[PDB]
């Protein structure tokens, strides 16, 4: 058909036109690190965690947003892409708070897991961290914006999936904040899912607060019966 | 340095959603023209101008003004909130009728722009970001203003006062206090960022139309 | 064949009304040769105009330096169904730069004519001018020039006896340096906050309102009609190969006569300062450092600026780049670390902050420079700072991160001994 | 000639001059193109 | 504390393929229920769809 | 360094240091620690149950 042949670490794969680098890497069998990309949301290209090296290309590209073209060789484990991941995680963790023991997302945090796998193990940040005031968007979602990494994933989910446009970004630069800018409650029948999409503990479940840790829990796959959707 | 301006809004008797704000009919005509500029179906592209107009009618931007602009343009109010909190020329707090802005970036800082700021400090008796008790002047330190070559310079309500000295800014402040409007532009007998005594370019009378048109045209 | 540049005759310049000594309205523009035989140029077709621009060797004056003929040719694709727009970048945010403001306040009709000619070559339906919000009086002057053109029939209904319809719109920003970036500028025009968007898609395919678009500097579009009228070869005579043309220079800082001046491209920096600027304060030996192209370009010391040319390639050879041709000079009686720290603070204030590298790393670099200014750090940190810059550079969405990383890199590379001495002094005095 | 400054006029600009001129120009301009719908939210 | 009575509460076995697991279950004499693997279907992602001229994929902010 | 009987400490103000992070429960080789937590009256992250089986502990 109209499939184009690309290479991931020298292994050929046939992909449709318009496919991104991240999706081709998925097809070969690799998961590119990500913080702002969600397959169910629109592409943002903010966190810059998915930076990967194309062979014979002097600049790293964003895998989640860069469509792939015929003949590229994607070098996911090259020293350039590894250094890019380490630098991006260093920048992400520079202003993050030391709240892991008191965070509800201890053993199920993408920031922690991707720092363990794709980041360094020590800091060279000798400054004072920032702190922002917590918002209050209702009794269902507990808000601690000091843990926010500004991936703008909740904003996209609210605007597109939930059709509710009260979330947004106020400010410019390092003191840019996510919220409503007013005392407003983010109320919708799909409001709890911002807890799931948020990779960090900035948004958590208030009724679940402090109750358990992920490794303790046993998971049973079952069916909802609150309505006829099942 | 840290900004200090909050990016969250708390209801105030002065700044609450019930605060009366509306556009005068002339501002309605201006809004109509502004929307007429942009293609059909993309009225949101008029958020920045119309909001500015609201400020020019009120002097600052309460939450009521943001809500009114959002209602007029049929856009979610949060979008107007982001636009207002992103751009620095939007005043989300009341300011004095004369808004003094001093440029202290490296090209201005090199030509002793701190002296002019300190002269303003002494003449007004207020700190860098405060407001005079009579609500006449508001001092703010800003970034580059596009007049680097003719530094140091200040901006007071859409006017540029350039090539300043402490004496010059003292005179401008006292003249603004008196009531009359000072003449904008560089001081020290200079017009339009020309060399002070060089005049190394643009000395001959300019040539007329079609001086060097090539053949075939 | 020519080896020495820097003697540009008065009659051979472009912006003859740079200093505002003549009338800036339609009558003055007619007296100076503007709006002359514009109808013939419009009728000669877009292909001829693009060919003239390509043979002219013009490069973008916004700072990127990309050849404008190639960009406009990329814009020259056939129709799609959507309208096509031309955007002129009059944001003028980068510190040390004052030329776009002058050419828009004192000679706007060249800008209007260039907008019309560029739109004709580009197939553009209309032109949007994104002027800096702080520029109010000159925005009004440009609006008056546009009204005079509209009344005379120079733009709008057939714009000439040519049959081509073109509109020119003026849009004012609101205090945001990042809005000068082409994608951020498009975002701001579209009524959103000025955050640059990723590429692809490029503006030539998806731009303003989702329509094909190309963003150009004021100087580029302003010189395009004169290039077309006098021919590409005449412009290509000046400067070196791949560096042809005349350039507007702003000279600021520690000079006797800071000024703006149009000069041949590859003029040596020293004679440029000594001729038009009146020389460094206290003589040439007093010079300490110079930033040749605005805050984004790295600084260079006296030793290399003694015998350096002023164009894209020769400045890249000096590891700096021409940028926007904004010369900022500093003599030996100043704190260079303080100046670079101020520039980094400006970049910290003016980053939109949507991508993690620029936001976080630029705040980090601002803090590290603030600590360096008083010497509170230790030398082992200097290399660390270098590493931090290399993490910002090339990993961000737009070039603001690059433009914030480069000044730190230049300062470190050329005055590491100054930082080390300051650290030693602080350590000794505080014990 | 070049000795005299010919740009003393920007001394007499009001706070509504830009918008007034936009209103004046509004009726010299051609109809805008359309995307077929009132907004992306429609 | 939480007390239990069956021995097989914490017993979870890992298998490479479905057929291997089913063979193990049949060999050990256990009645089994199998449900098929769920894979996320591929999706057409495009950044340029955000800035749409006439479609509804036009994002309000970013 | 000698390690004998266990104890739960508190801050000089007199308010207990334990924040119910459950790391001690997860690291315990003998599974001798049982923890249950909930938000307090002031919203503090505190344990409502913290048991150590000293017949299971290996010290
Ligand atoms: C942070 C930033 C600010 C910029 N500001 C301006 C500006 O004020 N004026 C300008 O012409 N270009 C500016 N640029 C460069 C633009 O990308 C450039 O104008 C655009 O590519 C078109 O320029 P050209 O006419 O040289 O092709 C800026 C770039 C960045 C990254
Ligand atoms: S969000 Fe993740 S990394 Fe941040 S404090 Fe919570 S658990 Fe730790
Ligand atoms: S709150 Fe969570 S999902 Fe929303 S922007 Fe911050 S980190 Fe992303
Ligand atoms: S580099 Fe800075 S200004 Fe540019 S998009 Fe990223 S955060 Fe914004
Ligand atoms: S739960 Fe255990 S590890 Fe966590 S604070 Fe309490 S005693 Fe310490
Ligand atoms: S996942 Fe691609 S930049 Fe965030
Ligand atoms: S540095 Fe002062 S106007 Fe730019
Ligand atoms: Mg979460």
Describe this structure in words.
This is part of a larger assembly, with chains A (230 residues), B (217 residues), C (431 residues), D (42 residues), E (62 residues) and F (59 residues). With 217 residues, chain B is of the alpha/beta class. Chain B has 7 helices and 5 strands, in the order ααααβααβββαβ. In chain B, strands 2-1-3-4-5 form a 5-stranded mixed β-sheet, with helices on one face. In chain B, a hairpin with a 3-residue loop joins strand 3 and strand 4 (160-162). In chain B, helix 1 (25-37) packs antiparallel against helix 2 (47-58) and helix 6 runs parallel beside helix 7 (166-178). The longest helix of chain B is centred in the N-terminal third of the chain and has 13 residues, at 25-37. A 5-stranded mixed β-sheet of chain C has the order 6-5-9-7-8. Chain C has a 4-stranded parallel β-sheet with strand order 3-2-1-4, with helices on both faces. In chain C, a hairpin with a 5-residue loop joins strand 5 and strand 6 (259-264). Chain C has 3 domains: 26-237, NADH-ubiquinone oxidoreductase 51kDa subunit (Rossmann fold), CATH 3.40.50.11540; 246-331, Ubiquitin-like (UB roll); 336-430, NADH-ubiquinone oxidoreductase 51kDa subunit, iron-sulphur binding domain (de novo design (two linked rop proteins), Up-down Bundle), CATH 1.20.1440. In chain C, helix 15 packs antiparallel against helix 16. Chain C has 431 residues and is of the alpha/beta class. Chain C is 44% helix and 12% strand. Chain D has 42 residues and is mainly alpha-helical. Chain E is mainly alpha-helical and 62 residues long. Helix content of chain E is 16%, strand content 0%. The termini of chain E are far apart. Chains B and C meet through helix 2, helix 4 and helix 5 of B and helix 5, strand 3, strand 5, strand 6 and strand 9 of C. The structure holds flavin mononucleotide, iron/sulfur cluster (SF4) (4 copies), FE2/S2 (inorganic) cluster (2 copies) and magnesium ion (MG). Chain B: Its EC number is 7.1.1.2. Chain B: Pfam families: 2Fe-2S_thioredx. Chain B: Residues 181-217 are annotated as: Disordered. Chain B: InterPro entries: NuoE-like, NuoE_dom, NuoE_N, Thioredoxin-like_sf. Chain B: Keywords: 2Fe-2S, Iron, Iron-sulfur, Metal-binding, NAD, Translocase, Ubiquinone.
List the helices and strands and how they pair.
This is part of a larger assembly, with chains A (230 residues), B (217 residues), C (431 residues), D (42 residues), E (62 residues) and F (59 residues).
Chain B (H helix, E strand, L loop, with lengths): L24 H13 L9 H12 L4 H11 L3 H10 L11 E6 L2 H5 L3 H11 L12 E6 L10 E4 L3 E3 L3 H13 L6 E2 L31
Parallel strand pairs in B: 1-2, 4-5
Antiparallel strand pairs in B: 1-3, 3-4
Helix pairs in contact in B: 1-2, 2-3, 3-4, 6-7
Chain C lengths: L25 H6 L6 H6 L2 H11 L11 H8 L9 E6 L8 H7 L2 H15 L3 E6 L5 H16 L14 E6 L9 H8 L23 E5 H13 L1 H6 L8 E8 L5 E6 L4 H7 L11 E5 L8 E2 H4 L6 H6 L8 E6 L4 H14 L6 H18 L6 H13 L7 H31 L1
Parallel strand pairs in C: 1-2, 1-4, 2-3, 5-9
Antiparallel strand pairs in C: 5-6, 7-8, 7-9
Helix pairs in contact in C: 3-4, 3-6, 6-9, 14-15, 14-17, 15-16, 15-17, 16-17
Chain D lengths: L16 H9 L17
The complex binds flavin mononucleotide, iron/sulfur cluster (4 copies), FE2/S2 (inorganic) cluster (2 copies) and magnesium ion.
Subunit structure (chain B): Core subunit of respiratory chain NADH dehydrogenase (Complex I) which is composed of 45 different subunits. This is a component of the flavoprotein-sulfur (FP) fragment of the enzyme.
Catalytic activity (chain B): a ubiquinone + NADH + 5 H(+)(in) = a ubiquinol + NAD(+) + 4 H(+)(out)
Cofactor (chain B): [2Fe-2S] cluster
């Amino acid at each position: 058909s109209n499939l184009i042949e690309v290479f991931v670490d020298g292994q050929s794969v046939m992909v449709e036109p318009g496919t991104t680098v991240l999706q081709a890497c998925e097809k070969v069998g690799m998961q590119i690190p990500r913080f702002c990309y969600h397959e169910r949301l629109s592409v943002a290209g903010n966190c810059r965690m998915c930076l990967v090296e194309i062979e014979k290309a002097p600049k790293v590209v964003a895998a989640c947003a860069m469509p792939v073209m015929k003949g590229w060789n994607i070098l996911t484990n090259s020293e350039k892409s590894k250094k890019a991941r380490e630098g991006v995680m260093e920048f992400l963790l520079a202003n993050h708070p030391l709240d892991c023991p008191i965070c509800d997302q201890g053993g199920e945090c993408d920031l922690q897991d991707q720092s363990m796998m794709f980041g360094s193990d020590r800091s060279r940040f000798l400054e004072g961290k920032r702190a922002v005031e917590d918002k209050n968007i209702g009794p269902l979602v507990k808000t601690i914006m000091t843990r926010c990494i500004q991936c703008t994933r909740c904003i996209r989910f609210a605007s597109e999936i939930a059709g509710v446009d009260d979330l947004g970004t106020t400010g410019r630069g390092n003191d840019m904040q996510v919220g409503t800018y007013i005392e407003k409650m983010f109320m919708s029948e799909l409001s709890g899912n911002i807890i799931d999409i948020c990779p960090v503990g900035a948004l958590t479940s208030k009724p679940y607060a402090f109750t358990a840790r992920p490794w303790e829990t046993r998971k049973t796959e079952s069916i909802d019966v609150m309505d006829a959707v099942g | 340095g840290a900004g200090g301006a909050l990016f969250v809004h708390r209801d105030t008797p002065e700044n609450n959603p019930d605060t009366p704000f509306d556009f005068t009919p002339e501002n309605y005509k201006r809004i109509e023209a502004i929307v007429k500029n942009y293609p059909e179906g993309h009225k949101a592209a008029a958020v920045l101008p119309v909001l500015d107009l609201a400020q020019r009618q009120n002097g600052w931007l309460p939450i009521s003004a943001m809500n009114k602009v959002a209602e007029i343009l049929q856009v979610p109010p949060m979008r107007v909130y982001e636009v207002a909190t992103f751009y620095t020329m939007y005043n989300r707090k009341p300011v004095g009728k004369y808004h003094i802005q001093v440029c202290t970036t490296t090209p201005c800082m090199l030509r002793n722009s701190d002296s002019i700021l300190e002269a303003i400090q002494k003449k007004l008796g207020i700190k860098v970001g405060e407001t005079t008790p009579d609500k006449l002047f508001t001092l703010i330190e800003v970034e580059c203003l596009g007049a680097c070559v003719n530094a140091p310079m200040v901006q007071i309500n859409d006017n540029y006062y350039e090539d300043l000295t402490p004496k010059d800014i003292e005179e401008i402040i006292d003249e603004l206090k008196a009531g009359k409007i000072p003449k904008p532009g560089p001081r020290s007998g200079r017009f339009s960022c020309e060399p002070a005594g060089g005049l190394t370019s643009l000395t001959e009378p300019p040539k007329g139309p079609g001086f060097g048109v090539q053949a075939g045209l | 064949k020519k080896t020495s540049f820097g003697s540009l005759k008065d009659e051979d310049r472009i912006f003859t009304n740079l200093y505002g000594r003549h009338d800036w309205r339609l009558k003055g523009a007619q007296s100076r040769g503007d709006w002359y035989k514009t109808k013939e140029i419009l009728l000669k077709g877009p292909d001829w105009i693009l060919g003239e621009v390509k043979t002219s060797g013009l490069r973008g004056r916004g700072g990127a330096g990309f050849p404008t003929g190639l960009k406009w040719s990329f814009m020259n694709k056939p129709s799609d169904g959507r309208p096509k727009y031309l955007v002129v970048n009059a944001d003028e945010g980068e510190p040390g730069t004052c030329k776009d403001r002058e050419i828009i306040r004192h000679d706007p009709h060249k800008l209007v004519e260039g907008c019309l000619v560029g739109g004709r070559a580009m197939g553009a339906r209309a032109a949007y001018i994104y002027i800096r919000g702080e520029f109010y009086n000159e925005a009004s002057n440009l609006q008056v020039a546009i009204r005079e053109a509209y009344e005379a029939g120079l733009i709008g209904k057939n714009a000439c006896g040519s049959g081509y319809d073109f509109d020119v719109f003026v849009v004012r920003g609101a205090g945001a340096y990042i809005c000068g970036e082409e994608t951020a500028l498009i975002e701001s025009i579209e009524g959103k906050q000025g955050k640059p968007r990723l590429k692809p898609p490029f503006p030539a395919d998806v731009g303003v309102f989702g329509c094909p678009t190309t963003v150009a500097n004021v100087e580029t579009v302003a010189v395009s009609p004169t290039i077309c009228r006098r021919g590409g070869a005449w412009f290509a005579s000046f400067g070196r190969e791949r560096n042809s043309g005349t350039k507007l220079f702003n000279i600021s800082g520690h000079v006797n006569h800071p000024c703006t001046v149009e000069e041949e491209m590859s003029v040596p920096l020293k004679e440029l300062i000594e001729k038009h600027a009146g020389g460094v304060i206290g003589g040439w030996d007093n010079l300490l450092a110079v930033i040749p192209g605005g805050s984004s370009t790295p600084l260079i010391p006296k030793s290399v600026c003694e015998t350096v040319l002023m164009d894209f390639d020769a400045l890249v050879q000096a590891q700096t780049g021409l940028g926007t041709a904004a010369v900022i000079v500093m003599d030996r009686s100043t704190d260079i670390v303080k100046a670079i720290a101020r520039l980094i603070e400006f970049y910290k204030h003016e980053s939109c902050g949507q991508c993690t590298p620029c936001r976080e790393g630029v705040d980090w670099m601002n803090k590290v420079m603030a600590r360096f200014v008083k010497g509170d750090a230790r030398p082992a940190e200097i290399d660390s700072l270098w590493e931090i810059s290399k993490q910002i550079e090339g990993h961000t969405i737009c070039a603001l991160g690059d433009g914030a990383a480069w000044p730190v890199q230049g300062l470190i590379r050329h005055f590491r001994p100054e930082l080390e001495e300051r650290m030693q002094q602080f350590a000794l005095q505080h014990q | 000639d070049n000795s005299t400054y010919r740009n003393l006029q920007h001394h007499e600009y009001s706070t509504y001059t830009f918008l007034d001129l936009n209103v004046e120009l509004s009726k010299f301009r051609m109809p805008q193109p359309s995307s077929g719908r009132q907004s992306p939210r429609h | 504390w939480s007390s239990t009575a069956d021995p097989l509460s914490n017993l979870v076995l890992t298998f490479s393929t479905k057929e291997d697991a089913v063979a193990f279950a049949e060999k050990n004499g256990w009645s089994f229920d199998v449900e098929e693997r769920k894979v996320p279907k591929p999706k057409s992602k495009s950044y340029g769809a955000n800035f749409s001229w006439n479609k509804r994929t036009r994002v309000s902010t970013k | 360094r000698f390690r004998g009987e266990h104890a739960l400490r508190r801050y000089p103000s007199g308010e207990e240091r334990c924040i119910a992070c459950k790391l001690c429960e997860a690291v315990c080789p003998a599974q001798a620690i049982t923890i249950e937590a909930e938000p307090r009256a002031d919203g503090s992250r505190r344990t409502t149950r913290y048991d150590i089986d000293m017949t299971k502990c290996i010290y």
